[PDB]
Amino acid sequence: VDEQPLENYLDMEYFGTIGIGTPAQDFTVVFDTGSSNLWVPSVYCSSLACTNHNRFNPEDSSTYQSTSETVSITYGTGSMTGILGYDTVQVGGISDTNQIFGLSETEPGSFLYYAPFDGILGLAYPSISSSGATPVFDNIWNQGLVSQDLFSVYLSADDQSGSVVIFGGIDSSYYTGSLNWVPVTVEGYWQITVDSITMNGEAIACAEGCQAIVDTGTSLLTGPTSPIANIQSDIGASENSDGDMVVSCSAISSLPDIVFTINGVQYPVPPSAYILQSEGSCISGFQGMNLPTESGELWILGDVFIRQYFTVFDRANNQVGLAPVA
């Protein structure tokens, strides 16, 4: 069974090291369940972010195959354009041969400049892959490189070592009790129904259900701007001088759990998880963002939620498994 250790950067970003090419050039990539493309910076890129991150040099790989096709990807934070190429990607002890990935041409803006990771390795469904490029886990499964068509994530808390993605297996060491299984509603993101969001037995948002994605590549709990403004009032958060939504640090001691009910099972998030300790003050772990789709406006169960719950992403049965971390 095949594990990829991930580095935890300030409880906000989780990334690991992959090898691309023969011999392997090393890159750090966010393992992102909210996107499906793999890309890294290349020598074709002259953007500011390309000058201070590792750059794939296709001339130096004996196994590189070029294409005449391009990729463009827009994220909630950051964007890129590139050209698609094929090479061997070494991920979690698996030699994923003939992998299509993007070599960046432009990475515009300051976000990717200041970020500690080089690229993104998307772990979601092929239907949201830009230029229809085969995702890494799809290519690993199609080549019979794993036996179980699933992967599982443990994200550590408090800047600690130990975060892992496990390709083709579960490790029951990481969770307590048994896995509860939730059907994926739409096969794109890892999208599920959240039955309701409650505090003190009252629905504060999503009273008659809402659609949420489980996203290792989103730092915070995200939802539509109007229900999120309601949640901010409920937890006593006010917009500070610099735009930040702050809450008194003393108040963690007296706030109740916010409960996500998913498939009739209660998933409490404590105030010590949903209020973050940042640069000396305490901030809300809830962020307002509108992502409208065919199936309404999405919530994101970001890293705040995943830290509390060991997550299994099952592609054989199109289900997500959740259990409390040990």
């Binding site: 992102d32 493309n37 909630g76 590549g217 989103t218 963002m289």
Partner: peptide, 6 residues
């Protein structure tokens, strides 16, 4: 922070 694809 990070919000990972539109």
């Amino acid at each position: 922070x990070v919000v990972x694809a539109x």
